[PDB]
């Protein structure tokens, strides 16, 4: 479940922290909030490796571009480079991204689909929990949100996904990109899914496991 | 649902704002009217990704054309669109209407269906929702209409297309191309629904 929300003086994005393989939770606290540049962050849904790989590649080329032009990178540059890359691979790179950030031009919020289509919006949601999130955004979003209101709306839209969508769960990651300020990455902004104390300690008496052979392994030269 | 209509003072482009991924509306405030040049715009129907990639390449080609040979004709813009759509017909799902304003040629409309064929018309309709307004548009279209008449013609036409087509809806965006300049218009459900 990934969302992006525009406010007064910038933009906020948020995501859940669940990774799945079939019905199994592979990672209970993965980070889907990626840094392209210091003040341009990406929320990724779809093929986990594709969202990470395409974000790092464009992030690398953006850094080189920023050094080459002696200018802070723009969101539209990251948007253009991502969509032309994804389009070239005709959707075979399953990356569904919410691109957001602040640059000399202002604050921006875009979405990119795997096939290379881009949208513009004040509030966006992508992933399996996009409908649970978008339901909340469509209910509570308004023009001229404050920073604290936008974070609340964003995290509320992610919570909708966590609870109601089986594809989403665990914690809420947030990144706030305000104009004239450093972007603040709020890793595990909410942790409403803490595992309850187990009923019993399964610490085995020592020697429980039958052993055939022991040997010292040489790691040194 | 997209259309472009020539009239006395130039040409007007109109479109709905609905983007669908199946029966889910991915974007209800989509801008399907894209500027390839100062006074050459296009209406995009079919694959959002395909029409986007094409429009971006055409915008690049006409920017480079302008640098060397000055302002391109609307026919030239349509030719570049056709060349991409025709030569990549096997890998593209794009139905594009090209509309532009010259001072010599006034308002012109070129429609480019799936095949990649070019058709110069007085007015053009396209997209899933266009099927429902062939009858209406043919009966109501006149040549050398006024701006207000043409805006009403597009508003009423897309209103019906939106009403019947589930794949169409949201707001009616319009772009007016005349000697005066470029004017963006928007019309909300509360207005057009009860026409």
């Amino acid at each position: 479940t990934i969302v992006g929300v525009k406010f007064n003086n910038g933009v906020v994005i948020a995501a859940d922290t669940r990774s799945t393989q079939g019905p199994i939770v592979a990672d209970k606290n993965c980070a889907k909030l990626h840094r392209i540049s210091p003040k341009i962050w990406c929320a990724g849904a779809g093929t986990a490796a594709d969202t990470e790989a395409v974000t790092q590649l464009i992030g690398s080329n953006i850094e080189l571009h920023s050094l080459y032009t002696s200018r802070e990178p723009r969101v539209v540059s990251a948007l253009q480079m991502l969509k032309q890359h994804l389009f070239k691979y005709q959707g075979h790179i399953g990356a569904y991204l919410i691109v957001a950030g602040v640059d000399p031009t202002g604050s921006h919020l875009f979405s990119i689909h795997a096939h290379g289509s881009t949208d513009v919006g004040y509030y966006l949601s992508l992933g399996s929990g996009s409908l649970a999130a978008m339901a909340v955004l469509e209910s509570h979003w308004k023009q001229d949100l404050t920073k604290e209101e936008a974070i609340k709306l964003a995290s509320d839209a992610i919570q909708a996904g966590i609870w109601n969508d089986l594809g989403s769960g665990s914690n809420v990651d947030v990144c706030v990109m305000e104009i004239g300020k450093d972007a603040e990455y709020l890793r595990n902004y909410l942790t409403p899914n803490v595992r309850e104390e187990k009923q019993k300690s399964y610490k085995f008496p020592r020697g429980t496991t039958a052993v055939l052979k022991e040997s010292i392994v040489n790691i040194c030269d | 649902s997209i259309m472009a209509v020539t009239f006395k003072d130039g040409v007007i482009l109109g479109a709905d704002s609905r983007t669908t991924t199946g029966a889910y509306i991915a974007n209800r405030v989509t801008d399907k009217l894209t500027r390839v040049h100062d006074k050459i715009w296009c209406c995009r129907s079919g694959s959002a990704a395909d029409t986007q990639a094409i429009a971006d390449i055409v915008q690049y080609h006409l920017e480079l054309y302008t640098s060397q040979y000055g302002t391109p004709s609307t026919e030239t813009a349509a030719s570049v669109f056709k060349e991409l759509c025709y030569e990549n017909k096997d890998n593209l799902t794009a139905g594009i209407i090209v509309a532009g304003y010259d001072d010599k040629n006034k308002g012109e409309v070129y429609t480019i269906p799936l095949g990649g064929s070019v058709h110069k018309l007085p007015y053009a309709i396209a997209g899933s929702g266009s099927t429902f307004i062939y009858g209406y548009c043919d009966k109501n279209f006149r040549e050398n209409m006024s701006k207000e008449e043409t805006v009403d013609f597009i508003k009423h036409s897309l209103s019906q297309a939106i009403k019947w087509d589930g794949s169409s809806g949201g707001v009616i965006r319009m772009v007016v191309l005349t000697a005066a300049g470029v004017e963006r218009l928007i019309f909300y459900p509360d207005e057009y629904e009860q026409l």
Binding site: - | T21, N27, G46, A48, A49, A126, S167
Partner: peptide, 4 residues
């Protein structure tokens, strides 16, 4: 996917 997105596709009037």
């Amino acid at each position: 996917x997105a596709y009037x």
